[PDB]
Ligand binder design. Structure first.
Ligand SMILES: Nc1ncnc2c1ncn2[C@@H]1O[C@H](CSCC[C@H](N)C(=O)O)[C@@H](O)[C@H]1O
Ligand SMILES: Nc1ncnc2c1ncn2[C@@H]1O[C@H](CSCC[C@H](N)C(=O)O)[C@@H](O)[C@H]1O
Ligand code: NA
Ligand code: NA
Lengths: 281, 321, 367, 281
RNA sequence: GGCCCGGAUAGCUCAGUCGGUAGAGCAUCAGACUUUUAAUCUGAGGGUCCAGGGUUCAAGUCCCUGUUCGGGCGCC
RNA sequence: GGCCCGGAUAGCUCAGUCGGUAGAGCAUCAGACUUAAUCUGAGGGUCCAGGGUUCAAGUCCCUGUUCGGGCGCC
């Protein structure tokens, strides 16, 4: 399962194939079915089922392929982007600043594609729980499906409703809240109602800055504290060996060298992360 | 739930922290002051306090020249400086990781708190994992892992010197239920272990055989070579660490190495591309930027960069034949 | 002052650029189109234009939803066919009308957010209402263009980094500057603008000629050339120790270089240069250890390198050598910003690929 | 002088002293003057006058000092901070975006300490000119003094007045404009009236984001086009060789390496820069 | 007589003229060791960088005064 | 025939199960070397088109054009 490692691949699972480069793809397992790839052809009944994760699975014209056990970070990359998602870089920082752990209770909105949602369940297992919200009828159902296909319904509840009006469907039970909606400043009141009376942490993701100015202006009104707006910025390096040729000066020290050059020339902007704390006072 | 004697705790003035242990009549110091920790016991976590002559108490001429927002900035500094309040919070990876980076960064090799979170997520740390670790960051990393596991699973701490350091670890204040899955094994018996060549005066003989016993327990679990992950973050060169320790890992499991500098990991990257049985190598770095957000006076403060070290991550794979 | 024929000019669509010369009856390409530069000569600079069949004509310079909670991706939200769109386009309609038609047939447009509408329109006008502007060349524009278009020609020198080199080197009027670049001569160009012809530049080239394709796009007058000089990179060591020394079409050029090289050779022999800049595909260590001998005491210098590792060696080799101070290994990160109401945020943080810079001053030796 | 190099020191000049580390200081050479340093003392009558820039200058005790020819970038790091200034990082970028060259006519406000004012004069010499503004009496007066002590008054004229209320003191003669004020959106009109009718450039330094939104909104309405908004962030690296020790595994590759670590783990935020273009239309 | 310059953070005391100040020693404590009122070896705990105000829309590249230490010229 | 995969950018054509899909070759042009041949170097890039969607962050699918692979009768 997503929540716990299992040595052997079994039907119904969700496995990740690593083609090569950084390119990958996710697949659901079913007896008799097949999948097509760059390197070759895999038959789900013999090339997969019963083989342990991380095997050089042969396929087609001498082609192989490596298979990986599912994790939230791997799913984040190969899942179907029903919407725009937050990558594991933002997720990591949010997961820590909200003080998440096994046995915690969380409220998310919007659910969206379930990139964030899967990263949460992983940590809060096996006694924690989630009460995600999504006012879009389809994405709501489609998420519930993925949660069932992945076998994680025990630790999640999808509530098809608005958050800025109906709240998270709960009250005085949540340890942490996360927001990834266009207008989070209107859900601040319900975030307080949702959070435990004993206290909790808060987080609001917003691409624009006025969204922050309004969110903070609303958080202060409700009585949150320890406001701090952070912004994480990843930077991956393509490793490569290079050699600058010497200059011809008429002469007859200039040794090669390794280096880590960035991948994209310029790093994109995910969004501003605003955190806060609820304390009894 | 409620505060109690003996429990470990963190303090907070504004954005400054320091961790201590609650002991009856144990004087301490904090921001140039000096307290006693006796009166704090019977309150809830998150309670504020003001210094008094002795023990803590728990409560509930050209000024007008400055503008509306400059006058509020002038007051806030001169009131906070003379009247400063001290809160009490329950420990957490968040608070300690920010604290140690600000109070004792040299001890933890400048691992910025944002960089730490990436390792917790990239290594897929969760309940029901057999993890391997080798760190010299005062057990801060060891504490972080434990928090995300919650007693479920196990951890094997490799150490050099006399014994494993776990100073910051204690500040978390974990129950006794978590030490069950905690073991140790000296680092100078690994090459022996890989080859399979591994093997009041009374107070010592009891502490000695009891520990060496615990070492052979770890030596077996390591010998299984079926870990669910590896983490590394020390003051040593990481290249050789992986080339030996990764053999203890099972295929299709994540690993994450930290390094205050980049050049060692560039050597470690090639030494892995040559080795075999790994994929999706990812030499990454994370920059963080905090902000100041007030109406009509909203601007970025700091851009914390470069000092956050570098990370080399990936997953394992079987070897050919 | 005003645009004319034969001029050197830059084009601009949205944030895409390309340099071209105005030639009478000259066909050119730009973002998958075909132009003729005859019909754009008389206007002033900074003039917008629209394409038709070849000639460039000069143009002029509500019900909205709230949430996407009930916006499903059918594909049949737009109600005209992929062949109909071609029918209107081939018809030669203005384009302003095309956009207006699409909005009418979009069944969802009147239910989208006011920003999604403003975004949806900006997405169409970018494609149909192809407004191309014309601009006069400058160190500003060309540097951005090259980095965005041909970064591999200038060793990935980001324009912000370039701006630093001009400042750290104290580039100005009345300086005997030395340069060794392989960035299409762009570096030589950025200098000459900040010199305005005054002073002199001593360029050092590898192979058999200094690259000046970029330098041409500035369109500097001939007066700036009287102060320019060149000198091949292979005889530099011979110049340190004083070991330096259609047939007529060959004689002239071979005699012009000689007649122009001996001049350059002298100005270097004086060893009284007011500064040095370096930015090439070659290792920077040896380039410094020799060329610095040609610089007077107390003058600035700057060296560029796409990678960091080489300058670390320079940093150390310059201490063994001595006679320098204020060594400062620097990188400049650049972050642009989109700035609309309730719609303000960064777009791209240009980092790492902008290269690095080593800067300092010269000093007398110990003897 | 500032504008033009000179091999020998002379009285009235403003030289710079390297004290080692990054620490330096600006000094005006007068006959009979002294200056105390951590290395000893300099007597200007013999230790400076008549001998060339960049010379090894002893200081009585045996200690010595290196003297440097003056430049705007060096003045920026040793001038008397009357008000907060822009540093060579921010400046260098602006100089290029405004297309400043020898002959360029320029306007500035405020003048403040005159960190920027010197950088401008340098490039635009010897044919260009500047028209600055400073509605404070003292800082305006002090600026005039410095420009005359540096012998650069030829290329500058100061005006004591409010720019937002009385303009830059000229009309349609300037190739470019710059602003460092708490309310640059009020001077947008006068800026247009100052810049040549043929066209020109514009700039505004304002670290609060709210100030930027107003400026851009005011600019476009006036007729300005080609708006953009940049922020530069320097990052300096200390070169220090290091060696990570190897771990003991019982074994009776670990090669050291050069490296460049950042001087500041945290870089401060100067301000947001906001450019634009004027065109007949 | 004055004047000028340069430093204060660990319980104490120190870190240079490559832009070398989050680095360390004394003390302390714990292992290891043997020489046991304990030494030695190896490690660990301990860091927000003095006070008091001002200028600057904004200072994490800044000024003035005080406490304290050091350096250097000389009755100006 | 159907189904599932993977790519189109320089005038043309390529880019690897981690040694660059911003990297190059051809052609072209220029120097260098001579008997139009032969070496070196330079100019030349915004990613095939159209539509619908994500937050107001390019992030994803569909359709169409074209090149090629794979399963083998659904
Ligand atoms: N008021 C509201 N209540 C509940 N969901 C909302 C909402 N407003 C917007 N949303 C939902 O929020 C989603 C944001 S996309 C978020 C993706 C998600 N955070 C992830 O990375 O996994 C959208 O799909 C939208 O349907
Ligand atoms: N409305 C106004 N008109 C003219 N000057 C103004 C002004 N508002 C503020 N100022 C002046 O602008 C100055 C800004 S400090 C600017 C520093 C300068 N740009 C540099 O870096 O060199 C202040 O000293 C203030 O006196
Ligand atoms: Na002290
Ligand atoms: Na092609």
């Amino acid at each position: 399962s997503f929540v716990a490692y299992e040595e052997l691949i079994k039907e119904g699972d969700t496995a990740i194939l690593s083609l090569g480069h950084g390119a990958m793809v996710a697949v659901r397992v079913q007896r008799g079915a097949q999948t097509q790839t760059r390197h070759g052809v895999l038959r789900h009944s013999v090339d997969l089922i019963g083989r342990p994760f991380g095997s050089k699975v042969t396929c087609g014209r001498g082609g192989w392929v490596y298979v990986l056990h599912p994790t939230p970070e791997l799913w984040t990359l190969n899942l179907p982007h029903r919407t725009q998602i937050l990558y594991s870089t933002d997720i990591a920082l949010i997961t820590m600043m909200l003080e998440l752990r096994p046995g915690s209770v969380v409220c998310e909105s919007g659910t969206g594609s379930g990139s964030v949602s899967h990263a949460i369940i992983r940590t809060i297992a096996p006694t924690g729980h989630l009460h995600t919200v999504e006012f879009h009828q389809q994405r709501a159902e489609k998420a519930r499906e993925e949660f069932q296909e992945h076998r994680v319904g025990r630790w999640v509840t999808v509530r098809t409703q608005d958050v800025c009006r109906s709240g998270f469907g709960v009250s005085h039970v949540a340890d942490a809240v996360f927001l990834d909606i266009p207008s989070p400043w209107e859900a601040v009141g319900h975030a307080w109602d949702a959070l435990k009376v004993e206290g909790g942490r808060f987080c609001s993701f917003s691409p624009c800055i006025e969204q922050v100015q309004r969110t903070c202006q609303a958080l202060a009104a409700r009585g949150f504290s320890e406001l701090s707006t952070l912004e994480v910025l990843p930077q991956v390096y393509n490793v490569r060996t290079v050699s600058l040729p010497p200059p011809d000066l008429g002469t007859g020290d200039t040794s090669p060298f390794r280096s880590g050059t960035p991948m994209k020339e310029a790093v994109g902007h995910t969004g501003y992360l605003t955190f806060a704390t609820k304390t009894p006072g | 739930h409620r505060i109690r004697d003996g429990d470990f705790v963190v303090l907070k003035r504004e954005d400054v922290f320091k961790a201590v242990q609650v002991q009856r009549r144990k004087k301490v110091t904090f921001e140039k002051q000096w307290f006693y920790l006796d009166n704090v016991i019977g309150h809830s976590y998150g309670t504020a306090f003001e210094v008094t002559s002795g023990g803590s108490l728990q409560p509930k001429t050209t000024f007008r020249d400055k503008t509306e927002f400059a006058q509020d900035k002038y007051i806030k500094k001169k009131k906070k400086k003379y009247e400063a309040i001290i809160t009490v919070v329950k420990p957490s990876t968040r608070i300690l990781s920010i604290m140690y980076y600000a109070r004792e960064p040299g001890k933890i090799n400048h691992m910025r708190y944002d960089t730490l979170a990436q390792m917790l997520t990239l290594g897929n740390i969760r309940a029901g994992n057999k993890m391997i670790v080798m760190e010299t960051c005062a057990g801060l990393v060891l504490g972080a892992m434990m928090e995300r596991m919650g007693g479920f699973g196990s951890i094997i701490q490799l150490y050099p010197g006399g014994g494993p350091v776990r100073a910051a670890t204690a500040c978390f204040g974990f129950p006794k239920s978590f030490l069950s899955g905690l073991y140790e094994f000296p680092l100078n018996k690994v090459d022996s272990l890989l080859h399979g060549t591994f093997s009041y005066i009374q107070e010592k003989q009891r502490r000695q055989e009891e520990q060496r016993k615990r070492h052979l327990e770890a030596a077996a679990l390591l010998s299984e070579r079926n870990a669910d992950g590896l983490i590394v973050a020390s003051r040593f060169h990481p290249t050789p660490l992986l080339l030996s320790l990764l053999d203890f890992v099972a295929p299709s499991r994540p690993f994450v190495v930290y390094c205050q500098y980049k050049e060692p990991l560039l050597e470690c990257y090639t030494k892995l591309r040559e080795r075999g049985g790994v994929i999706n190598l990812r030499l990454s770095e994370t920059w963080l930027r905090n902000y100041q957000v007030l109406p009509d006076r909203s601007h970025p403060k700091l851009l914390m960069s470069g000092g956050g070290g570098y990370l080399l991550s990936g997953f394992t794979v079987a070897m050919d034949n």
